[PDB]
Design a binder for this molecule. Structure first.
Ligand SMILES: *[C@@H]1O[C@H](CO)[C@@H](O[C@@H]2O[C@H](CO)[C@@H](O)[C@H](O)[C@H]2NC(C)=O)[C@H](O)[C@H]1NC(C)=O
Ligand SMILES: *[C@@H]1O[C@H](CO)[C@@H](O[C@@H]2O[C@H](CO)[C@@H](O)[C@H](O)[C@H]2NC(C)=O)[C@H](O)[C@H]1NC(C)=O
Ligand SMILES: [Cu+2]
Ligand SMILES: [Cu+2]
Ligand SMILES: [Cu+2]
Ligand SMILES: [Cu+2]
Ligand code: NA
Length: 499
């Protein structure tokens, strides 16, 4: 069952064996992935998070981010540790109480402390639309049509060297899959469909690192949503999905009753499908209970290309139709050396006092804010352009902005910008050497918003900056509850930190 919009959520340690290998984990709701949190557009969510963690090897503190929800007026509930809150300590709880006006689509939630989400704290978050403009395109849309793609590691995250090329041991589809080495025939996930029906498949990357080449043998996929943003219908036979992205696609159950492989090939780790790695099963009602015998093509003739996507609504692009045609045009210098990433010459290391608390305490320009050189102020009610030229090692890097979605004016692997009708989204691959992926948005949401690569190992190695949007209005826009004001004193006391 789905939970929410008002619910408790307990965070616990437990052993799990999703690929046949047992290891301890950090779990929401006792499962991997965690339960789906759901509601309708405009609802009040009150997710009271109970930190019941006791195993220090995966950190006993926690903090949860609601990925892609704008948090307008509730910046304190966004979740990134040391940006909008101090962590919740073990044996305590915290009510994330926020609203979702003007958003409907497919989201997710995850730990936003260190690399803790890799250790298991990740799950879907769906905001349904009772008047969805795409409703007539399918018959079924429920918890059974969510498809999660996850990387899974046998080594615990706090034992992964910082700045290393860290590689997974299994791909998990809906929580199950097989290990790349020492492969055992452990159970595969089954997605069941009825011949003739149409399904809104909500494809969610909960990855800590790899991108996946996702396809379904014999089937094609009609994209209708991108990171929460309704799209024009785009039919493809493969989707390359980067960490933290989401798509909804219509699956027409229009092939002969039978079993079909669902494939998710990561860019690192095990290549191919030997032994049923990187796989799940699409089963039609009435089919024999047996593995598929289907083949992938050698090449995919209609892969997703990001410039083919266009919004369903007339969203346009803010600003003027040329590079630098914005009120505040930025170009970030994104670099890697010696195990650490940097943005504009500064490697991110979380501050002792959360950025939001520094601003509420009176620090009111970005040079007064810590970490020094890691906070850029943005002016209010202004068009912002951010160019993100690629080349730093470890690519392709999926950059994500909190508090906002954005127009993708220039996409990976294509030098031509689009100032007319590009897709809007919240996490974007910045591509390869020589690319100049560029995003635009308008500043109508005061608060400190993290900008970072969503490969969690890269964030941990410093690939982040904070946009302090409309510092002067942050305090009046974001009144804080007493329980939020209590977090930093409790955390600092528990960890013997002075501030
Ligand atoms: C990516 O595009 C940005 C503009 O959005 C380019 O920025 C210009 O860079 C040159 C130096 O390289 C400066 O003289 C300009 O002031 C910048 N802003 C402009 C022209 O509007 C950036 O060079 C591009 N990067 C790549 C790798 O193509
Ligand atoms: C490279 O990106 C550009 C810009 O998004 C794409 O150009 C558009 O192509 C569409 C589809 O044919 C035309 O309707 C638009 O007028 C083009 N816009 C511009 C500004 O040129 C282009 O198709 C992409 N290249 C590839 C190979 O997909
Ligand atoms: Cu996220
Ligand atoms: Cu986010
Ligand atoms: Cu990265
Ligand atoms: Cu983040
Ligand atoms: Na415009």
């Amino acid at each position: 069952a789905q939970i929410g919009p008002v619910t408790d959520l307990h965070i616990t340690n437990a052993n799990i064996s999703p690929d046949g290998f047992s290891r301890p984990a950090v779990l929401a709701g006792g499962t991997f992935p965690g339960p789906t949190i759901a509601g309708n557009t405009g609802d009040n969510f009150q997710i009271t998070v109970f930190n019941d963690l006791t195993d220090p090897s995966m950190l006993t503190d926690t903090s949860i981010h609601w990925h892609g929800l704008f948090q307008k007026g509730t910046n304190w509930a966004d979740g990134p540790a040391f940006v909008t809150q101090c962590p919740i300590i073990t044996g305590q709880s915290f009510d994330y109480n926020f609203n979702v006006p003007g958003q409907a689509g497919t989201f997710w939630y995850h730990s936003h402390l260190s690399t803790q989400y890799c250790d298991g704290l990740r799950g879907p978050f769906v905001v349904y639309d009772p008047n969805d403009p795409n409703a007539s395109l399918y018959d079924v849309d429920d918890d059974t049509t969510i498809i999660t793609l996850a990387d899974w590691y046998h080594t615990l995250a706090q034992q992964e060297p910082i700045g290393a090329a860290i590689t997974a041991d299994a791909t998990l589809i809906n929580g199950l899959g097989r290990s790349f080495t020492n492969t055992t025939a452990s159970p595969l996930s089954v997605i069941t469909v009825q011949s003739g029906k149409r399904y809104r498949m909500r494809l969610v990357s909960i990855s800590c690192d790899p991108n996946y080449l996702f396809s379904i043998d014999g089937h094609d996929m009609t994209i209708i949503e991108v990171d929460g943003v309704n799209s024009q219908q785009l039919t493809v036979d493969q989707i390359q999905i980067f960490a933290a992205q989401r798509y909804s696609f219509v699956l027409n159950a229009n092939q002969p009753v039978g079993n079909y492989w669902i494939r998710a090939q990561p860019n690192s780790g095990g290549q191919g499908f030997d032994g049923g790695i990187n796989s799940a099963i699409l089963r039609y009602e009435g089919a024999t209970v047996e593995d598929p015998t289907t083949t992938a093509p050698t090449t995919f003739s209609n892969p997703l290309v990001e410039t083919d996507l266009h919004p369903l609504a007339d969203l346009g692009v803010p600003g003027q139709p040329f590079r630098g045609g914005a009120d505040d045009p930025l170009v970030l210098n994104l670099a890697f050396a010696n195990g650490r990433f940097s943005i504009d010459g500064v490697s991110f290391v979380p501050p002792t006092v959360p950025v939001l608390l520094q601003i509420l305490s009176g620090a009111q320009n970005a040079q007064d804010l810590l970490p020094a050189g890691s906070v850029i102020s943005l002016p209010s009610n202004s068009v912002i352009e951010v160019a993100l030229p690629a080349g730093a090692a470890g690519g392709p890097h999926p950059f994500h902005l909190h508090g906002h979605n954005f127009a993708v004016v220039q996409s990976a692997n294509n030098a031509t910008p689009n100032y007319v009708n590009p897709i809007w989204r919240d996490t974007v691959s910045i591509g390869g050497t020589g690319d100049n992926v560029t995003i635009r948005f308008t500043t109508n949401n005061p608060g400190p918003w993290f900008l970072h690569c969503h490969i969690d190992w890269h964030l941990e190695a410093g690939f982040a900056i904070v946009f302090a949007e409309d510092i002067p209005d942050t305090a009046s826009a974001n009144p804080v509850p007493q329980a939020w004001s209590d977090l930093c004193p409790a955390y600092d006391q528990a960890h013997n930190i002075s501030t």
